[PDB]
Paper text:
To prevent the heterogenous modification observed both with the racemic mixture of ML162 and with the pure enantio­mers, we produced a mutant form of GPX4 in which the second reactive cysteine, Cys66, was mutated to a serine (termed GPX4C66S). Mutation of Cys66 to serine, along with optimization of binding reaction conditions and the use of enantiomerically pure (S)-ML162, enabled the determination of a co-crystal structure at 1.54 Å resolution. The crystal belonged to space group P212121, with one GPX4C66S molecule per asymmetric unit. Clear difference density allowed the building of a complete inhibitor ML162 covalently linked to Sec46. As expected from mass spectrometry, the Cl atom of the inhibitor is lost and the acetamide moiety forms a covalent bond to the Se atom of Sec46. In the absence of a deep binding pocket within the active site of GPX4, it occupies a shallow surface pocket at Sec46 where, in addition to the covalent bond to Sec46, it also forms interactions with the three other residues of the catalytical tetrad (Gln81, Trp136 and Asn137). The side chain of Gln81 adopts a new conformation and rotates away from Sec46, which further enlarges the otherwise very small active site. Surprisingly, the thiophene group of the inhibitor does not engage in any interactions and instead is directed towards the solvent. By interacting with Sec46, Gln81, Trp136 and Asn137, the inhibitor targets all of the residues of the catalytic tetrad of GPX4 and thus fully blocks the active site.
Residue numbers in the entry: 6 to 171
The structure:
C-alpha cells in the first residue's frame, strides 16, 4: 500500500454499501463530509438526522456525504452491509453509504489511513479515530480541511461550510 504519498481523497476507491467499487475521484469539485458510523449508539440518531439535514440543505451547492460503517467502537455496528443500508433508509439517507470497514490499525481502509495523517486530519490527542461519528471535511480538491470529533454534532460543521463553497 502506497497511501502515505497520496495528496487527495480522489486517489482512493472504496466499495459502496451494495459491494460495488467506487472511484472517489467522482467527488472532484465537491465538498465532502467523510464519517464513520454505527447503528447502536446513543448518538446514532443525532448524527444521522443532522447529516441528512445538512445534505438536504447543501446538496444543491455541492455538499456530499460519505458514510463508512465501522464496528471498532464498542462493536456497535454488528450488522451486515444490507442491514446497515436498511437502517440508514429508516433515516431517509440520500447521501452515499459505503461497505463496513476498519478505520484504525493495519487493516484500516487506506483512505482513513491517509486522512488521519493530513495536517488538518490530526485529532485533539492524535491521529487515531477515537470513537463512532468522527467527521472529516474535505475540500473540492480532495484535501482534508477540518476534523470534528465524536462529541461534536454534525450541525457544528455548518458554520464552516460557506468558505469551502467559494
Ligand atoms: C455506539 C456507542 O456510542 N456506545 C455504546 C453503546 C452500547 C454498547 O454496548 C451495548 C457499547 Cl459497547 C457502546 C456508547 C453509548 O451509546 N453510550 C450512551 C448510553 C447508551 C445508549 C444506547 C444504548 C446503550 C447505551 C457507550 C460508550 C461506553 C459505554 S456505552
Amino acid at each position: 500500500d502506497d497511501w502515505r504519498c497520496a495528496r487527495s481523497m480522489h486517489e482512493f476507491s472504496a466499495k459502496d454499501i451494495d459491494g460495488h467499487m467506487v472511484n472517489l475521484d467522482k467527488y472532484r469539485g465537491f465538498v465532502c463530509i467523510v464519517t464513520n458510523v454505527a447503528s447502536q449508539x446513543g448518538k446514532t440518531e443525532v448524527n444521522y438526522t443532522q447529516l441528512v439535514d445538512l445534505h438536504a440543505r447543501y446538496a444543491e451547492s455541492g455538499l456530499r456525504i460519505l458514510a463508512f460503517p465501522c464496528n471498532q467502537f464498542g462493536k456497535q455496528e454488528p450488522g451486515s452491509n444490507e442491514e446497515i443500508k436498511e437502517f440508514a433508509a429508516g433515516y431517509n439517507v440520500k447521501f452515499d453509504m459505503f461497505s463496513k470497514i476498519c478505520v484504525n490499525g493495519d487493516d484500516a481502509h487506506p483512505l482513513w489511513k491517509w486522512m488521519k495523517i493530513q495536517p488538518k486530519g490530526k485529532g485533539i490527542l492524535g491521529n487515531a479515530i477515537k470513537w463512532n461519528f468522527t467527521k472529516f471535511l474535505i475540500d473540492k480538491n480532495g484535501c482534508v480541511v477540518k476534523r470534528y470529533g465524536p462529541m461534536e454534532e454534525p450541525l457544528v460543521i455548518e458554520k464552516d461550510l460557506p468558505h469551502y463553497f467559494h
